[PDB]
Design a protein around this ligand. Structure first.
Ligand SMILES: [Cl-]
Ligand SMILES: [Mg+2]
Length: 179
């Protein structure tokens, strides 16, 4: 089965399957080469509030549908347990940004700027560094288990869009190393 668009907006697409393409967002903390924290592949997407209002509205609507249609009944989920956070409230590079966390245990497809699929972890890590711009396909899902109630986003694919200043390495919290 293929993706079928339901609604297209500036900087994104909602598909009939519930998948969401988020376009032209800045990446942070990429873990596409190897899984990180059951370890999962992940990425953080920084959506500028000025340019991504329409796709953020879709994301909010899909989050609410995901809560409502949860299998055991409509699920009450705290704002801090959603895959989208507010960069101005909840967190410097996040200022004026919506902050999306998407994860998957299955390696997402990773495409370079020429839309070639990258297979090698070293090339994946070199191409998609924190600070570059990407587009991504995600899909919301609801979690209700012993670890809590969340609305999460599966990470299906990432496309590199453009280079920009790297955020650097030095952004890992080292404060728990001796515990
Ligand atoms: Cl980063
Ligand atoms: Mg938009």
């Amino acid at each position: 089965e293929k993706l079928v668009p339901a609604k297209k907006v500036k900087n994104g697409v909602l598909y009939k399957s519930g998948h969401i393409k988020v376009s032209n967002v800045r990446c942070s903390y990429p873990h596409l080469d190897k899984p990180y924290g059951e370890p999962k592949y992940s990425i953080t997407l920084l959506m500028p509030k000025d340019t991504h209002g329409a796709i953020k509205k879709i994301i909010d609507e899909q989050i609410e549908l995901t809560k409502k249609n949860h299998k055991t009944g409509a699920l009450k989920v705290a704002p801090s347990m959603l895959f989208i956070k507010d960069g101005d409230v909840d967190f410097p590079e996040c200022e004026g940004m919506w902050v999306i966390s998407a994860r998957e245990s299955t390696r997402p497809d990773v495409l370079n700027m020429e839309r070639e699929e990258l297979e090698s972890p070293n090339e994946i890590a070199e191409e998609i560094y924190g600070g570059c711009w990407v587009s991504s396909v995600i899909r919301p899902w609801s979690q209700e288990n012993k670890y809590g109630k969340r609305i999460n986003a599966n990470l299906l694919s990432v496309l590199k869009r453009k280079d920009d200043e790297p955020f650097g390495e030095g952004r890992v919290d080292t404060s728990d190393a001796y515990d």
